[model samples]
Target: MEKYTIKETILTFNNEFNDPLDKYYKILSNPKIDTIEFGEKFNQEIDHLIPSNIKVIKFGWTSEFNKDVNFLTESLTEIYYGIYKNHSLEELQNLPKSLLKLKLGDVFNQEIVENVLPGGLTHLTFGEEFNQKIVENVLPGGLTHLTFGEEFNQKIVENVLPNSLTHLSFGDCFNQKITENVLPNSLTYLEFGRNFNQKITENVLPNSLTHLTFGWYFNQQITENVLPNSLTYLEFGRNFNQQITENVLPNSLTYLEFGRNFNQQITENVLPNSLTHITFGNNFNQIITENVLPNSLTHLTFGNNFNQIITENVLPNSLTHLTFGDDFNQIITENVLPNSLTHLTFGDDFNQIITENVLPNSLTHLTFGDDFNQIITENVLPNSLVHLSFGCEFNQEIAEKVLPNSLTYLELGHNFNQKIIENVLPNGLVHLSFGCKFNQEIVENVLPDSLTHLSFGHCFNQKITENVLPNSLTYLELGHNFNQKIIENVLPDRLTYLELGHDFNQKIMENVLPNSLTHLIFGTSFNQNLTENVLPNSLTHLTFGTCFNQKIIENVLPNSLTHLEFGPKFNQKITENVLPNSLTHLTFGTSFNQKITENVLPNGLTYLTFGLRFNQKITENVLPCSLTHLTFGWYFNQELTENVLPDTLKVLKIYYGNKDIILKNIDTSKIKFKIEYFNKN
Candidate 1:
């Protein structure tokens, strides 16, 4: 027999969980027992152990509670699903009565179906392969929230979903399909990711559906007048090519993302008036301008498009985040950005005509990507800036300007042929990215020890020996330059994200990976000697670039992986069968003769890229149905067989392909293509 105290148990459980940390579970138990069976029943009439305030309940690996028991009677607000066994029908039903939210993992049983769910359940998540079967009757009347994998069928959805349901998600269940009419009226959030869904017309959707997210590979179409008026958040990414006019979007809409579509176009009249946040990459230059934006708009990003002549007064005062692409190389004055502005990204060669006096004060995050060589003196950065990135700039002399004290993240890539001054970085710096072009001859003294994230790309000249990096460093990227001479002692224990570039050919470093690493990007040259001991258990995003694609094992991928990008050489074809269930975004082009099929791609891929001419048969059927935007490489065959494309496509850009073939019926208001012809002597 063990001693028991009501207050002590409650306090113990509270202390165990009442803190801010990465998500986990906590168990409530009696402290009196010194030795209890791993899978034993605790029979007691103790209501003291139950904390009504206890929102989260966590169970760890291979743990089990009594099957024929009523040990826990208190209502739970939050429960984290981990490794657990199937429960009896009665146990499942009894559990939901007091449950407000339930998160069941892959191992959860299907035998305990809809009857197990309580009427009061507001949030419910069914893990992978746990096919909770449909009940013959309607779902619990009080049910409001639902989420499940792709294995769930229409029968299960129709039966289990109550009219009260507000949020629903179909995550990575490729087998199931949903129609607009089948959707419940109370639904506010609907996420159809990684499935065989196609065509969402007005007839199939409910007027109540407001939030919809179709992941990277779900190539579904939304024709004109299809969107409901109640919608607020809409994300159509990955391989989806849904054609949308402003009329289809509800006036209530606030957030919208139409990126990755091959033929996306948004004109001013076609854009919704209620949009507050929007991301329309590549071909969105047609509809939007500083003057056309809704006054309520806050966040806006345009990638790989042409929007050069934006006047200062055209931008809304509500603006916060703004990103510019390659074709956007015009003047940006301080007045262009509102006081609410924080994050700003400039891609390619954007000339910074604004002087130090013209920069905004509210600015915090800044990213300049690839081939940009503009001169930005150090004095111009606002005091509030915490994150700054110069991705591959041609100018290196600007390194003389010391960062503000508040600065934390700094990335400088591509232009390594410049002098790096010592002690030039601010003490507050926590993240840093340095490519080979910036200070190739790296000395230990040049780096600021305060950094937590560091990336070194294409360091051909720098030869790093045994040297201790910052102890605080958490994320490291050594692509194209790092060699095998580095050791464990020189690396930091806090490292999490690690990317080994082309030059890091040694396979032995896999053994040196720290336990803290959660994301890993390996090159093709690295051998496959890595085992569970060598690889970090925390990895969530593992990528195999061209060099190491074939050597990677399936089981080696960390269970935590949620996003993965493989290089072109490794996978024979980019499809769901060859890829993991966790991947959300894949970056690759046609290097091999791999035909990218429409429905075979993963549901999680919200953003994907293909090569110039990855598909020889470039037709509506051959194209990935999920594609929202397609990038045509410079070498793609200019002689296309057909002009008609999938209506799902929203944005299209020919980066390297022939310029002679004109795109017919293109929305000139949203985007205008400029053709440059060369004279062949």
Candidate 2:
């Protein structure tokens, strides 16, 4: 939950960490608290917490566990509800009296509150699974602000909503059937996601509504009646079904998102004059007609579906951000992207589609997504690009010679394999993800020290020594690689997610995992020496690629673990005594050696995975209705009974072993599976 300003975290890493590295040098290490000692120091600093006078709290980026939330919640007396993940109804009931605003978690239920809080709630945010009964029962009579999810039903619209509510929103609710009469007069904000498949004619919308949002893939039939003059913000992406005519839309509309679905005729005369931002691309074939669009347009995004003739004069002078999609195949003429544009994104072979001198000087953020070898490196980039991502591969020469220094977020994938260049990275980078063939020896002084998140997959050098990683790293992923022996205390203490595995004869070094790890994965070469005492308390998810012995049965598992996955080696019996209460998903990979009775699995497990792996006997009562995604391992011989699985099984991934395993009367389309070709010719 730690929040560091961009300047504090990236620009001055050496100064902040007291490192002698040069200004251009990169810093790598766990970026959380410096160490466990620092964590103690933080606790002591807040021993005498003081209250603040702030009435409303708005948190950015950080989670509920961060000290910032604890500091603000404990020190502030006049709390206006709160916005954080993982909050329960019991916690909400105990909030301070002055609280009026409520931003509950995604799984919030309003029925828990039989009566209004003593201070009375005026604003509410309803997230996933917000039933109409809960909405009608909990919303206060004096409610003024309310936001509902996409699935909000008509019963609540017809029966519960009070006239006093002015700022009402249906945000991403796509399931609700809406018509002109469905819009309440007192409502001001209306948002429609892709779920609703109804028509919007002239008489349906009220003049009182001002703001509206359509889903990125809204294909439902709609017309000018929805784009009335009273509307200001209009967002509809890809699935826009209506044919636009200037006379039908109101001059009052200002902001618009018309990307992907625009296949209709668009002339300068047909576009609204008051528009400021516009995103339209993909299906529109022709360029903007000469001098046809109004000068009022400011932002434009065109991508993935463009094959048109464009001239410089067709672009508006007031434009700021512009993007060209992947399907663009021809060269761009001069002045197409005006100097007014600050952000730009192009495909890897952009040079083929763009002539020299076509790039503008005002761009600040750039993304090149494929075939990057063709781009001209020199001075084409504008100095404004603070965030950059290389979607294509890059050799060491390209990394050293062409990369811009202004970037803060750098993503390099399928490039820099076995290539090394000292002091070649940008100094301002704060986050980096690498998908390269890397040896541990090169990480000593070559990797950037500025990175906060680092990931390595497929190719990892085995020579990486313990304690050699940068101290600024907080998230690390070593997917199915890094076969070297990891020493205890070698990893950064700030790590939240760690994935490591070894080949035969190579095992995870004892005591190697950092206490900060929340998600841990052990694949293949895992030894039985790993015990529960060695596991960290912060762990939430634990997955083993290969089976381990009895140590995992009695003590190695932590009570904090909510998700567990087991592969081939598991042979010991398991019950409630060895399982954690928070366990939600339990998957048995490969085939097991022992028999698992009906009660052997704990009741807390909402998900179960059984395929070619285990011959365990289980019935319908053993399965939980909460099961969602299930995948079977390779060894199964028997067919599964439909009654054994809950009706809530929406996504079931099963493996059909050598034997024919038939799932009687079940729809095959409801389940998905993938088979691997182990012995290919």
Candidate 3:
């Protein structure tokens, strides 16, 4: 078995164990284990007698025990049980005083409220079956967080809840009668249940609350003093049609949101002056007149069906961000938009011709609709714009248009088959993307020197020659059908990230890749061997494609690689020295079925994943000591021995077809590790 240092901790048991319990206990005697979990069926006798160093314990979905668990009393601080069926509060009376968090799927009875529950718990959560009413002298006074399930319909009266709670959430069916002085004074966040339709009056909510949310069926009319003065965030639920006016909403609210069914017209002096962000729902289709919105609002979003004419005095001067919904397809002319707008967006069906002076010069970001197919000319687009995007139906050629020199980001949407000439693109462009049907060759002096990131669509298969790409480019991505040969200096020298298309099946030759490249991705049909000196030394991440089935020989991959991925149909045997020592993350393909033996994997690996067809046998000492996470694919059904996995493992995942066969061969009493099992039919 592989030996680990004292600092090497964490273990997981997901697969079947073939060894006895004594052999596993001898290997897991280290006092560094702080967390443990059970996946399937485990022995409760040996599980309760674990070491005192374990502070957290978790149970998976299919977990079950033979007897009552009563030995967790000293060092355990947190426990999570999934689907609790047979455990009772009488068996849990010896819970430790050091426990801080407890979550279970059982109902809370008087036995748990008076005698079983510990008084020092800071966070507690119950399941859906817990529908008992919380009376006085039930809950402890030290809880800071509490959550209930959907069927929990409990009446929280005076002294029923703790005084130290800061966060509390109710379930869907909670419709309790909360009056004045019933809620605690220390609450800062509170959410009503889904079916809660109670009428909240003055002094019902505490003044210390800063965030409050109504339930789905809440239709109460909010009047003066209904909400506290300390609330900064408030949200209304569906079916709420209360008219809001001056002195109705709290003055301390900075963020407000209306529900979907609220179709009320907001008139003058209705909204609060302190509101900075507001969102209208889908049914609000009223005309926004002057003084309807406050001048302190900086962001505004309209409803989906809102279609109105926007004049100069319609919107406030303090708005910096504005968005139109899907049905807003109005004409935009000169003096229609405010000068203070820096970001603006048109809806999906907006098809308008934006001429000169229509858009404000202060705008820095602009977007068009999906059906916007207008031709852009010189001075039509503002010179102050830093980002611009065309819609999907824009098929005009942009060869002679005078684009602004201050533009840094641009996106030409679908059906745009324009040829990019020398001065057609701006000099200050940093990122650019092309849409469908762009299949022109990139000649010399076509791309600007300031471009840093570039991408192509699926139909682009243009040839890239020497000096065609700018030396300032750092990221490049090719489209489908781009099967080109990489000669010397064809790619940029400062390129760091590159991704080829699906049809790029060319072989990578020596001196073709730049030394500054850190991430490389191949196409689906790329089946070439990565021989020595073909890959650069600065590459830290690599990914293969679907049809890649090459043998990974020694020195083929650089020692600087930290992450590696294989695609489907990759079936290679990974022996010693085949992978670099610097690898920390590795993934296999769908058809990978390789044999992993001792000394085959590096000791610095922290994450490892198997593929769908991986059914190899992993013997003792096969895994490294530095591994913290491991995953098994769909068809993995290997029997794990006592010493097959290292002690440093923190998380484990397994896949099996039947739960009976998985728990039949493994001895769960000896495994002191977290487990997650995936059952496939």
Candidate 4:
């Protein structure tokens, strides 16, 4: 017997596994295998001895063999049957004692059913074609979960369902009547089918249910007695329009969500005090007074198109976060906002002007919408704010006292073209972003010294000189129109991440990029040669763009580089010394069709990926021993033998290939790697 070391626990078989009987036996022979799934057309007999460590087995359709229940192991706990044909109920008597979950895949008539399920089984599922009527005492009593098929809308009488069931789900067209005592008291979760809009009166729902959900078209009016007192979560469908008062909702309910078409008015004493989270529908445009919202509520969200005015005492004092929708054009002043608010957001149509004491001092984050064209003055924004964002219509120049010193993150919208002078942006800022229309040149001392991350938009084509960018910057992104030639010491010395724009086709010279940089990305038209002196020895990550198809000669790429990526049009051949010994990750683009041989790839590489056009054969000893992950592209269908893959390899993912031919050429017994198939369709 040939034994191979197994690394992965789950395995799937398709038409690719040649000699299905032998391959299946070899895979199960490994003690590390726990779960296995089979695809369609698997017709071999499963009488071969399976490992006792296997816990789950998923079967597929088989045309040659008749279904047998004795082929499974006693250690099996879960089984997903994809057997196309039906079997006698007597065959299921051979089920293992440890079986807990059983999902039947084929259809069976009512006469073939029996009370033959294992007593220890906890979960059971039926297929869509199973339309049989199950009467009293056919299901196991230990089942805690049960699911029906789409056509199983049959009546479930009082004694037919198990009392131990905790979760129950119905099919799409199921409209069966669930009266009192029919549902077990142990059920905590229940879901109705799509077309189930039947009226559920008193005692229809068990008192033990904590969560309840309705289907897509459920339009039943839920009265006071329809819901149980134990429900903590409730959800309604698209057409639910029942009037909920204090007597209808349970006091234990904490979360409630209405449908998109729900348009109801919530008056005083209607909502319970225990509710903490509430969401309204899109068409909800009703007035909200102080008595309507309970003091226990912490988060409240309004619906879209809500144009109601929020006066004093309309908003609850316990609110910490508030958001207005797109059509909300209401005015907010000091008394209208609660003192407990920490985050605030304005809608698209809001153009309110902020003066002193208008915004609360407790707010830490603020955001404006695209249509907000108001000007902010001194003391208008709270000093406690840490994050601020402007709208597209906000193009006002930021002067002194406009921004707080405690602010750390700021983002300008697309139309903001304000020039940054001293004190315009606070010195404590760490992250800053510009808009697409911002075409201002960044002069000396304009950017804050405390900045760490900076990004430019599409139209920011300014020339960046020495002292223009802050020395504390770690990440910088240039815009599309920036086509300047970078000279020595122009960029900050502490920069670690840099991304160029689309048309930045400048040559990279020595000292042009800081030696402290670790990641570098070129633009689309940058086809410059990356000589050893051009890139610093500290560089570890590099990426090329679409039009960059330059040949990589010896010593061009620094030995400290670890990860390399190419764009779509790159098809260069990688020769000896082109790849560094320290490299661990490498990826190719769409048109890459280079040949890979021994010593061509670095030994330290752990991840390697090919392109769509790569179909080259990988012979024996070509792959490095340090490689643990490897992937082939869409069109790769080359033969893989046992010796071609190293013992250190743990994952092997292949694309479009002749499954039967590929598996036959490889020695399955000598290999112990997990296999994955992609682009199966």
Clashes of each: 58, 36, 0, 0
By TM-score, rank the candidates, best first: 4, 3, 2, 1
Q: lDDT for each of the candidates?
A: 0.60, 0.58, 0.79, 0.80
- What's the TM-score of each model vs. the native? 0.47, 0.47, 0.76, 0.84
Give the residue spans of candidate 3 off by over 4 A.
1-34, 37-47, 60-67, 85-94, 107-116, 334-340, 399-402, 484-489, 506-520, 526-681
TM-score of 1: 0.47
Ranked by lDDT from best down, the candidates are 4, 3, 1, 2
Query: lDDT: which is higher, 1 or 2?
Result: 1
> What CA RMSD would candidate 2 show?
20.4
User: Could you tell me which 10 consecutive residues in candidate 2 have the lowest summed lDDT?
Assistant: 35-44
Best model per TM-score: 4
Candidate 2, residues 560-602: lDDT per residue as tens digits? Answer: 8888877677656665456666678886655554555454455
Residues 303-383, candidate 4: write the lDDT tens digits: 777889888987787888888778888777768888888888877887877678867888898999888877778888888
Which portions of model 4 miss their true places by more than 4 Å? 1-8, 14-19, 39-50, 59-71, 82-94, 106-114, 345-358, 390-396, 530-532, 551-556, 566-681
lDDT of 1 by residue, 244-313 (tens): 5556667888987875653555446556667888777565555445546777888887767766566666
- lDDT at residue 26 of model 2 (Cα atoms): 24
User: What's the alpha carbon RMSD for model 3?
Assistant: 6.8
